[PDB]
Design a binder for this molecule. Structure first.
Ligand SMILES: *C/C=C(C)/C=C/C=C(C)/C=C/C1=C(C)CCCC1(C)C
Ligand SMILES: *C/C=C(C)/C=C/C=C(C)/C=C/C1=C(C)CCCC1(C)C
Lengths: 246, 246
């Protein structure tokens, strides 16, 4: 199995160092966030979504530090394209949970809706089409990324509706400011993901594997750790509001 | 890109013919079921889950007839293992929808529960771990299939609870017989999927690609088309019951 496209070049040895440093920072932040979440579950009210997302993020960060360019992290393919399977597998593991957190922003509604199902189905579909585009090479790559773009447009529309509903269901004041911050983080990072797909080796190679890893680590820290911590803060605020007035 | 494991042998030219015949039958059944579902939506009450699952099944069947051993259907991998990405992508597209149908067996509850989220998260996780095991080769394959086994055990437990709840929420008589039939189909086919994974090239090679395709086509016709048609019949019975007594 020679396939000279498998060697290519992973980075510039500076993007590699930046990726390693960002992986260490992401692992440290995930460890600290998991410790804080455990402390909360022991003392305060904490949701399962933030803990699960942070745990998967920590596992993915460790696996990307150690075996990023190995199998179940990098499929090498007869087409000469190295597919970062770890990235898309972690997306499939976390993004549905992130959207289950987006629905029920205030951790009180034990019920859900058909809009949550639409969100989840569209998100799984867009991740599937993006992974297929990453493995696709050629016009099939363009077709599958356009399919993922349509599914992600549906996902973004449903997420925006969920964010408006959450903004209008939280108490007036700090709670809706936190909802606005969560919406900003969500949309900026989730829109940067397809941009990095386009700029990465999976699309037009502009970023290289290590530069794409740097950018994806930044927007994962934004969309998984920071967004989850903001959601936990929102739920803490909701609990305190219920204790005082509710 | 030579990697002599990519050639191997797809089948015995009899398993190939059986696979082609079963793909034609599955495509015909999916087309007829989609026509019937469109007729129902125009006249009767029909759910989106059955239509979506049947449409994805039809698309997957056509893509497996035409490009099964091509890219976005077969990742060839530097490890020499041909990964049927089409299979796992279709699982990711359909199984969450099949479980969204399993929750809300009677298409009346516009709300959902945290058990539905547990079902969906466990199902996505088990599909992810199974795909990773298929791409994994070696002891990593065993580890990831055991992780998928744990996630699928959680999925099966939640599905059994959902089936008991559905059995006890449908009217006594034909409705619960249909629920029992759906449970039998669901558990038999969904348990045959890991068995075929073990028996297929992705595990212990016993079945070959074409024999695995034959078995997977049979259990997809069981779990996607037949189960969805049974769910549609259950919802029709619920609607008629509400019209008479409800
Ligand atoms: C922690 C990881 C997250 C939140 C990943 C989110 C991923 C997306 C919003 C994916 C978007 C894509 C498209 C809309 C089109 C191009 C392909 C994708 C998969 C990158
Ligand atoms: C239409 C396709 C369906 C319903 C597929 C269902 C898939 C499963 C129940 C998957 C099961 C797996 C495990 C429990 C362990 C071994 C790996 C898998 C992914 C085959």
């Amino acid at each position: 199995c020679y396939c000279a496209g498998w060697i290519e070049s992973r980075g510039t040895n500076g993007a590699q160092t930046a990726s390693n440093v960002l992986q260490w920072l992401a692992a440290g932040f995930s460890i600290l966030l998991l410790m804080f979440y455990a402390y909360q579950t022991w003392k305060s009210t904490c949701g399962w979504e933030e803990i699960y997302v942070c745990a998967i993020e920590m596992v993915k960060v460790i696996l990307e530090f150690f075996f990023e360019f190995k199998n179940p992290s990098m499929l090498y393919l007869a087409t000469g394209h190295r597919v970062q399977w770890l990235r898309y597998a972690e997306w499939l593991l976390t993004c549905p949970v992130i959207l289950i957190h987006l629905s029920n922003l205030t951790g009180l509604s034990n019920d859900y809706s058909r809009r949550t199902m639409g969100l989840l189905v569209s998100d799984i579909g867009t991740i599937v089409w993006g992974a297929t585009s990453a493995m696709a090479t050629g016009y099939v790559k363009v077709i599958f990324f356009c399919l993922g773009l349509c599914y992600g447009a549906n996902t973004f529309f449903h997420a925006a509706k969920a964010y408006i509903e959450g903004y209008h269901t939280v108490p007036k004041g700090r709670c809706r400011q936190v909802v606005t911050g969560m919406a900003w983080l969500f949309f900026v990072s989730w829109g940067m993901f397809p941009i990095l797909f386009i700029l990465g080796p999976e699309g037009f190679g502009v970023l290289s594997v290590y530069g794409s890893t740097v950018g994806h680590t930044i927007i994962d820290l934004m969309s998984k750790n920071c967004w989850g911590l903001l959601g936990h803060y929102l739920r803490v605020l909701i609990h305190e509001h219920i204790l005082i007035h509710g």
